Structures are given as structure tokens and as C-alpha cells.
């Protein structure tokens, strides 16, 4: 297994950024997940070598950090907050609207591999509850009609 050059270049950049290569591990894993739509297990051995860390170190880090997913490829992660304020202000209405539009529940991926719903802890936009992200984009849920428009922008 080899990183495509366009990805390897970004990884090298991150590794050159901090005074010590090993400080780059989380930025590298973000970059890998961004590229593949998950962390492929096979990617971890070449990454460990670039970081000059043991593989077991890198695997332990991927296991520890909840943003990294080794199981499911998804082009778009719909992160839905299930914490106190969003629960009070209508997380259930948001999940219902997501099932009505995409046909999936938390933990599941659409059959085309386009959308995965990820239940997450407080995203700290609580004044704008209930909150969700689509990859890096963050929104207040208003209604199913508004949600349908937002999701229409991800192709």
C-alpha cells in the first residue's frame, strides 16, 4: 500500500510543520480520513514510518480519537449532536427529518456511500440547537424542508 503523491505531499507538509514529526499524527489522520472518507487500516503502517513511530502507537491513537473511523467509507459525515441542549431543543426532530430524506439512522451509511449519520457529543453551538455538521460545515436544524435544501448542496 502506497499514498497517492497528492496525499503524501500534504502528509509531508504536516510532518514538517511542528518541531517534531510525531506532533503531526492527528493532522495526518484528518488528512487521510478526508482523502479516503475513512482511515484504511493499510494506511497506518506507511503513516507510522513517515511519523517514525511504532505501528501500535499509531493504531492506539486512531482507536482513542472518536473523529477517526476505520469501519465505514462515507463521502459526507452528518455529525448530529445528542448532548443535553440539542436534546432539549429537538435532536429527535432532526434525526426523524434525516431518516425521511436519506432513509438511515445514527451509525448507518446510505447505500451509495454518500452520507453517514455520526451521533456526537456537544458541538458547542448550543444557542443554535439542535446542531449538526456536514463534514466541516455546521448548521442549526430549522425543519425537514430547510434540511433538504442544505443536503441538496452535497453531491
Amino acid at each position: 500500500f502506497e499514498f497517492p503523491e497528492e496525499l503524501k505531499t500534504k502528509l509531508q507538509e504536516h510532518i514538517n510543520y511542528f518541531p517534531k514529526k510525531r506532533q503531526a499524527i492527528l493532522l495526518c489522520l484528518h488528512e487521510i480520513q478526508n482523502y479516503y472518507g475513512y482511515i484504511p487500516p493499510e494506511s497506518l503502517k506507511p503513516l507510522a514510518d513517515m511519523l517514525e513511530l511504532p505501528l501500535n502507537h499509531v493504531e492506539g491513537v486512531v482507536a482513542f480519537y472518536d473523529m477517526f473511523d476505520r469501519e465505514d467509507k462515507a463521502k459526507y459525515r452528518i455529525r448530529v449532536c445528542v448532548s443535553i441542549v440539542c436534546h432539549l431543543m429537538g435532536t429527535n426532530k432532526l434525526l426523524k427529518a434525516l431518516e425521511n430524506i436519506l432513509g438511515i439512522k445514527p451509525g448507518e451509511v446510505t447505500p451509495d456511500g454518500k452520507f453517514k449519520i455520526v451521533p456526537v457529543q456537544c458541538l458547542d453551538a448550543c444557542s443554535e440547537a439542535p446542531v449538526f455538521m456536514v463534514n466541516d460545515d455546521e448548521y442549526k436544524f430549522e425543519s425537514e424542508v430547510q434540511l433538504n435544501e442544505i443536503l441538496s448542496r452535497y453531491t
Partner: protein, 418 residues
Amino acid sequence: RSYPAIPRIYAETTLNMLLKRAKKPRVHSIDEYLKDGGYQALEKALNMSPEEIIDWVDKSTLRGRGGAGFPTGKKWKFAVQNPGPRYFICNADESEPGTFKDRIIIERDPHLLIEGIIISSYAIGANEAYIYIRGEYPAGYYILRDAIEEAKKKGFLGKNILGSGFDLEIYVARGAGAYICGEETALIESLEGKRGHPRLKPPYPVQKGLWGKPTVVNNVETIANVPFIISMGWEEYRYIGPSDYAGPKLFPVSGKVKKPGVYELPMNTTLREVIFKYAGGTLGNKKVKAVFSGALDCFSSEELDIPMDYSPLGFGGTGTVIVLTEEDDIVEAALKIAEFYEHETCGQCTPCRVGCYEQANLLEKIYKGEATEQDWEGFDFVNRNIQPTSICGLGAVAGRLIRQTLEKFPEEWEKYRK
């Protein structure tokens, strides 16, 4: 350039300091910052000794805005009594429920934070500084990276800053989903490329931190105060609010209020005034049942007349105000808090590891009416026994808010027992 979408959190100020620009929901770049006299505090600071800067920050009564309220000047003094090199860390992990005060500084007025970081780094003799921003703040990350390049371009960063002989680089690290990585020692472990496992303290980071060197960790909001202390002087800064708990404070307000958002207010403001005078009162004018101070404390309707300061009888914490009204189920709310701690314990300490899990698992059975008598007595016992042997504040407080609901809303809990 174009940044990812950020909800437009309402921001309002009576002091026009931390939110002078950040009250407008958009990025303020270096030219707008410079137009408002930005980076003139940095120039003033570089003509003062580090020792003098520490003295002003001390005399200002500035206390840690991250939630513990530790005196900032006193933290700095502990650091500089230890030989260098020293490191300065901006904690931008902000992951407490209801706590969105730091993100509006980062996303809207990043140069206020950067100017703060440069002055603090100079004060403690740190030539290398880090911002650790949580993974779920990607927009904040790109905004800070661009802001730091603006600062470099204008000669506020790099070697020999404004002919002072002071060198500084600011590195931006990203989290990847762990609440615990906001704990200063777990944050340092993550900066070193490891799992976010808190360290036994003492030593405190100021004695042994990043690569074992003296390290100051400060919250975004704390650092954002430093330019004002230098610009105004500590004497003028201390005219803001009560002389014992001085300066502006950011109060993130959410749940059942008409105007949820961030309020810049003096710390002699009462909890009642935050909800009713500033946040516009309750949705549907319903009675306040409780206020969650993030996931830390629960205040009843009998505790609304407390100052929003770091006093013993004060609100304290992050200043986070989650408002529950008369129709919100306290046991349902308690379950959401248990679920949070269950998800976030790092597992190093046995009673934290099993207690956070069991507290959540048993309270769910209680909520769903599937709890045996044993599960009830179990829940009470584990709630009281998460803290023992804990090496960080998570285990120390994972039962705190829920115990407070048991003591302040016993009639609601008893309904669930029968």
C-alpha cells in the same frame, strides 16, 4: 478565502472589549483589527520587561476563564521561577456542554487571541507557542492559520519581533474528538503525538509540561484579556466590574431563553439578570426550574440571585448558563449528563472508568422504568464513588451535577422510584 459554514451565534456586550468586533458574526481580518488600534498593546508590552507584564496581569485580578478561576499572573510567576526553555499553550479545546464563548473570539476576532498569545509568550520567555483547537472547530482552525500568516506578514510573529529581539512561532494543533484532551496534561500528551491521558499532578505544567519543560496552559478567553490589561493598564482594567473579580466575562446562554447567545458582562451581574435582563427571559415566560453550569453544577430557581464571579457563593465555572423550565424532566436531563461522562472518561482510573459507564447505564434503566431495587441502590452508590483515585477533574466531578439534582429535585426522582 472561503471558510466552512458556522452558525451565527448571537453576541451582545455591555463593555465592548472581547466582543467589540466579535459581536458581528464574521471574520475580522488584520486590517480591521489594526484600524481599532490592534497590536499597539503588543508594541507597548515589548517596551516593558517580562517581569513588569507578569506584575500587571497579577495586579489585574485576571483569573482563569477556562473554568477553574486560577489567578493568571500567579500561574505565570510559578512558570518563570523554573529554568527554560518554556512553552505557552492556548487551550481552544472548548468541549463543555453549553460553552461556546471561546469559539466566537477564534472565528470572529482571531487577532485578539493572537495578540494575547504573543504578549503572554513574551512575559513567560516562551519562543514557541501552541493553539490546540478541538477537531469539531474546523472553521476556527482555518481562520487561525490564515490570521497567523497575516500576523507574520505584518512582523508581529517570527524572529526579532519589531526589533525587540523576541522570537515567537505559534503552531496550530487540532484535536480529534476527545473532551479529555482539554484537560491541560491530556492536551500536552496530545501535542506530543499520544492519546489524551491526563498526568498525575503535581507536577503542574508550569513545573513539567510539554517535553517536561515549564509550560503555561491558558484558556482562549483568559489570553484575550491580556491585550486590554496592557493597553488600559491594570488599574483601569480593575475599574471593570467588582475590584476583587475584575474584567469582562463571556456568558454563553442556551436552552429555554428567548435570546440564546454570548453576553459580555461584568462578573457582579447576577444569574437572574443574565437570564431575564440580558437573554430576554424564558421561552413562553415559563418558570425557570434549573440552570446547568455546563456539566459541572445544577442551580435551582432558589439560587438565581448569585453573582457570576469566582467567589465561594458565586456561579463560577465557565459562566455557562443552560436554562431548564418547569416542563423539562430533570431525570432526562441528568441522563444526558451521565451519557456525556460515559462517552468521555479516558479509562486510566478504575472508579472513573466503571463509574462513568455504570452511572449512565443504571440511570438509563431508571429513566426507562426497567431499574430493579438493586440498580437504584447501585446508581446512588456509583454516583458517590466515581472520584476515588481520580488523577483529573473529570472523575472528580462526573457525579457532581447529578448529585445536585438528587438533592434539589428529590420529588422528581421519587416519581421515577415508584
